[PDB]
Amino acid sequence: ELCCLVYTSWQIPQKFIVDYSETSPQCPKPGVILLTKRGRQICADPNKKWVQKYISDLKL
Amino acid sequence: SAQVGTNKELCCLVYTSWQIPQKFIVDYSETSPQCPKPGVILLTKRGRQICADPNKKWVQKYISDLKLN
């Protein structure tokens, strides 16, 4: 059910991101949800290199 | 609004089940064109949201009464 419609243009500083979630493949759009230290859940574009770079390291 | 850019924040997934008393609504806003179903977000004075179906007569009436004054 949970999906992204608008992606953030804010390249959230990596150390302000505590985790991320991927959205269902049934969503019309692909999306990852970034969770910030302030507890916001912010949709971001997985086709964006900066988002991909954060995910690659956030896994470590 | 913990959520930013998601359907749950930009769409009406479930309308109010009942007609709201008119005194509560002072404004409204549109939902995303990407939403699977129609919806308008009605706004209370406290800045709080109630999702509603634009196809309802009372919804159109409420909005019209606000705009025409």
Residue numbers in the entry:
A (entry chain D): 9 to 68
B (entry chain A): 1 to 69
What do the study authors state?
CC chemokine ligands (CCL) comprise 8-14 kDa chemotactic cytokines (chemokines) involved in diverse immune functions.
CCL18, also known as pulmonary and activation regulated chemokine (PARC) among other names (e.g., MIP-4, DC-CK1, and AMAC-1), is a primate-specific CC chemokine expressed by macrophages, monocytes, and dendritic cells upon infection or inflammation to attract T cells. We next found diffraction-quality crystals in the presence of citrate ion via a high-throughput sparse matrix method and solved the structure of CCL18 at 2.1Å resolution in space group P21. There are two CCL18 dimers in each asymmetric unit. The overall CCL18 monomer structure consists of an N-terminal segment (aa 1-21) followed by a 310 helical turn (aa 22-24), an anti-parallel three-stranded β-sheet (aa 25-56), and an α-helix (aa 56-69). The two monomers within the CCL18 dimer adopt distinct structures at their N-termini; one has the N-terminal extension (aa 1-6) followed by an α-helix (aa 7-10) and the other has a largely disordered N-terminus (aa 1-7). The N-termini of these two monomers (aa 2-5 in one and aa 8-13 in the other) form a network of hydrogen bonds and van der Waal contacts between their N-termini that bury a substantial surface (~549 Å2). The dimer contacts of CCL18 are distinct from other CCL dimers, which form contacts at their N-terminal region via an anti-parallel β-sheet, exemplified by CCL3. We find that the N-terminus of a CCL18 monomer within CCL18 dimer adopts α-helical conformation, which is distinct from the typical anti-parallel β-sheet shown in the other CCL dimers. Examining the contacts between the symmetry-related CCL18 in our CCL18 structure reveals a 630 Å2 buried surface. This permits the formation of a CCL18 oligomer that can be extended at either end in a zigzag manner.
